[PDB]
Automatic annotation (TrEMBL), chain A:
Gene Ontology CC: cytoplasm; cytoplasmic dynein complex; microtubule
Role, per record: Acts as one of several non-catalytic accessory components of the cytoplasmic dynein 1 complex that are thought to be involved in linking dynein to cargos and to adapter proteins that regulate dynein function. Cytoplasmic dynein 1 acts as a motor for the intracellular retrograde motility of vesicles and organelles along microtubules.
Gene3D superfamilies xrefs: Dynein light chain 2a, cytoplasmic
Cellular location(s): Cytoplasm, Cytoskeleton
Protein name as catalogued: Dynein light chain roadblock
Pfam family, one: Robl_LC7
Organism: Tetrahymena thermophila
GO term, biological process aspect, one: microtubule-based movement
Origin superkingdom: Eukaryota
Location, primary (coarse class): cytoplasm
Family matches, as InterPro entries: DYNLRB1/2, Roadblock/LAMTOR2_dom
GO molecular function: dynein intermediate chain binding
Length: 96, 49
């Protein structure tokens, strides 16, 4: 298919995006498209724990209602994560 | 001549003594294993569901 593998190529090519990284449910790197490897390795380990911890937050308040999309916003950067059961998509977009 | 065989018999008598014996017995209690469990409202319900 062109459709997932093209959209993922499109959001990378898109201006003011550092890189898109797919995390496996077992905290593993399927695709990692950042500049420096330290950042990509760091993002691969650190962020999927925040999303699991942030999933337990929304879950406690209402255990029917599951996480569909998490967006953190830092001083310099934004961090946006779209979690699913099979895979999790992560991006880092610099604020305009 | 006064001390006879039928005026001073000479009996032997001992008591039955058990033989002494030296044994070792080491008692060590059941092994004690660390367990770590976390419970959240969702994990309860997830099982319950």
């Amino acid at each position: 298919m062109s459709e997932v593998e093209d959209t993922l190529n499109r959001i990378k090519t898109h201006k003011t995006v550092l890189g898109y990284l797919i995390v496996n449910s077992e905290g593993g790197v399927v695709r990692g498209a950042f500049k420096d490897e330290e950042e990509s390795k760091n993002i691969a380990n650190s962020i999927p724990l925040l999303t699991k911890k942030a999933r337990s937050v929304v879950r406690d308040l209402d255990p029917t209602n599951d996480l569909v999309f998490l967006r953190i916003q830092t001083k310099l950067n934004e961090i946006m994560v779209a979690p699913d059961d099979e895979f999790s998509l992560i991006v880092i977009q610099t604020k305009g | 001549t006064l001390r006879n065989k039928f005026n001073y018999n000479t009996r032997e008598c001992q008591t039955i003594n058990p033989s002494i014996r030296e044994r070792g017995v080491s008692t060590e209690p059941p092994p004690s294993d660390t367990i770590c469990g976390n419970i959240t409202q969702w994990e309860i319900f997830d099982a319950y569901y």
